[PDB]
Design an enzyme around this catalytic site. Structure first.
Site, PDB file in Angstrom:
ATOM      1  N   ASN A 185     -11.165   6.651  40.179  1.00 23.47           N
ATOM      2  CA  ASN A 185     -12.581   6.064  40.079  1.00 23.47           C
ATOM      3  C   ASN A 185     -13.001   5.820  38.789  1.00 23.47           C
ATOM      4  OD1 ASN A 185     -12.746   8.127  42.718  1.00 23.47           O
ATOM      5  ND2 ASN A 185     -12.667   5.977  43.090  1.00 23.47           N
ATOM      6  N   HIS A 187     -13.566   8.309  36.466  1.00 24.88           N
ATOM      7  CA  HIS A 187     -14.440   9.295  36.076  1.00 24.88           C
ATOM      8  C   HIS A 187     -13.444  10.301  35.357  1.00 24.88           C
ATOM      9  CE1 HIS A 187     -18.066   8.769  37.851  1.00 24.88           C
ATOM     10  NE2 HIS A 187     -17.410   8.217  39.010  1.00 24.88           N
ATOM     11  N   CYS A 222     -18.873  14.097  31.599  1.00 23.06           N
ATOM     12  CA  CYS A 222     -18.640  13.491  30.279  1.00 23.06           C
ATOM     13  C   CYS A 222     -18.142  11.959  30.803  1.00 23.06           C
ATOM     14  CB  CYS A 222     -17.510  14.231  29.603  1.00 23.06           C
ATOM     15  SG  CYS A 222     -17.040  13.233  28.015  1.00 23.06           S
TER      16      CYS A 222
END
Ligand code: LL0
Ligand code: LL0
EC number: 3.1.2.14
Lengths: 263, 264
Positions: A185, A187, A222
């Site tokens: 995804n 991330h 982050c």
């Protein structure tokens, strides 16, 4: 892998790979944490999922708040490690996922882990408590009686972590995630943050000690284009206090502790 | 995994993991290249090793000079991929290791790879030709007749790569290896350099295209405390790129390569 007889836990065996091991020819803690994530995903797949029907309609996801790994013996390259994982409801706070790592030849417990997960809206990133409707749906996949990987009441897995105060003793500045550090995804993976925490530990500690306990609190993700500073201070065996923060304004992303034993 | 009937090649099956896949829910090229490395190591283990008796006595090691991967179909998360690998002597130049990636369900070839390896003194880093004494020791583990993963008369795997000239079109500055990027001998993993090459490709290319071919030449090693700049320039329905990896400081070359991408 497969679900156990009662359908309340999932077991899987992994052969340790050449690229997954460190200097000691044993699996790194990042390899272990990657394997825990994989067995967690396969448990979600085998039972029908990773979110419930109501969670998808309400745009809600499961996010990690804390990870606690404890390793007694890291498996060597070529060894087979067997991991059993299970989920349990913690009322309306969220869900807990636990793991047991065993030596496939002897059957002895070589490690154990626990993680705390909360519900969050994909968009807006708001923390919300667990609904009564999204509870009945997944309680059928969890044991009813408590089954703790860390049964010790008030142990290392449930200790509050303080904030590292400047100046740090050690540091690793300018860490940036690359494409391999992202999940499907886009991330950053929760395992990359473990690697970043450990980057500020001196190489002399790494060469003379072995990582025994690691507890990590997740506060903010982050982004792909964010830069991180990794800070460490000795608090002692060797004990350390760790802080991950954004290189710029210094916004906290993670905090944790590690305990190391002399080899 | 196991060696094949003739004991001249090694086969192994891998289940694709959740963390090993990209946005398309298929295995990244770095995951594939890591699997090729793993099957290479298991072949060395099964036959008795990854150096010969003579190589250890002379402090000599095998180092990669080139890697060439070509993927037609990246395996999906949960799919089983089967890889067959073999080695072949290339006279005194060095050794070549080849791979065939297949779909475990259909048996169709989904990809292929070849790599060139030379002999180097571990301490002085000085390269050298393969001596006859070393050649007799590993020739028993290689097929005698040529067995090429890339048979083609004019194949991409053996094309000379030019040096990227400044200014580059795209760049990714200040890349540093972390502990996970090191192997058991504390050297940077050959796969990390693939990730670094690809870091300068724009995200729009990555999102709209699939990587089909990647050829990478290894010139110098990146030390634990070295910093790298990744440079890319388009050289082309398909997209072609020229890549350069160099040290952030003085600009000493570490790698050069090309990639070919097709529209999804
Ligand atoms: N889909 S998942 O990974 O969250 C999952 C998998 C197995 C059991 C419970 C469970 O979810 C529960 F925590 F809500
Ligand atoms: N180089 S190696 O030790 O990884 C190896 C593995 C399998 C067969 C031959 C072989 O050596 C030689 F062919 F290069």
């Amino acid at each position: 892998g497969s679900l156990t007889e009662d359908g309340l836990s999932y077991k899987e065996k992994f052969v340790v790979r050449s690229y997954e091991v460190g200097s000691n020819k044993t699996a790194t803690v990042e390899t272990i944490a990657n394997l825990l994530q994989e067995v967690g995903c396969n448990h979600a797949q085998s039972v029908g999922f990773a979110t419930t029907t109501t969670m998808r309609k309400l745009h809600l996801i499961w996010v990690t708040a804390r990870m606690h790994i404890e390793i007694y013996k890291y498996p060597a390259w070529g060894d087979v490690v067997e991991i059993e994982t299970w989920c349990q409801s913690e009322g309306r706070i969220g869900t807990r996922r636990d793991w047991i790592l065993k030596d496939s030849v002897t059957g002895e417990v070589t490690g154990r882990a626990t993680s705390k997960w909360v519900m969050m809206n994909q968009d807006t990133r708001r923390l919300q408590k667990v609904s009564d409707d999204v509870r009945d749906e997944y309680l059928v996949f969890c044991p009813q009686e408590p089954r703790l990987a860390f049964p010790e009441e008030n142990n290392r897995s449930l200790k509050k972590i303080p904030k590292l105060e400047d100046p740090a003793q050690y540091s690793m500045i300018g860490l940036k995630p690359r494409r391999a550090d992202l999940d499907m995804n886009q991330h950053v993976n929760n395992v990359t943050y473990i690697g970043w925490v450990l980057e500020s530990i001196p190489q002399e500690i790494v060469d003379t000690h072995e990582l025994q306990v690691i507890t990590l609190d997740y506060r903010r993700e982050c982004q792909q284009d964010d830069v991180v500073d990794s800070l460490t201070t000795t608090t002692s065996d060797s004990q350390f206090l760790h802080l991950l923060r954004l290189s710029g304004d210094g916004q906290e992303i993670n905090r944790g502790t590690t305990l190391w034993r002399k080899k």
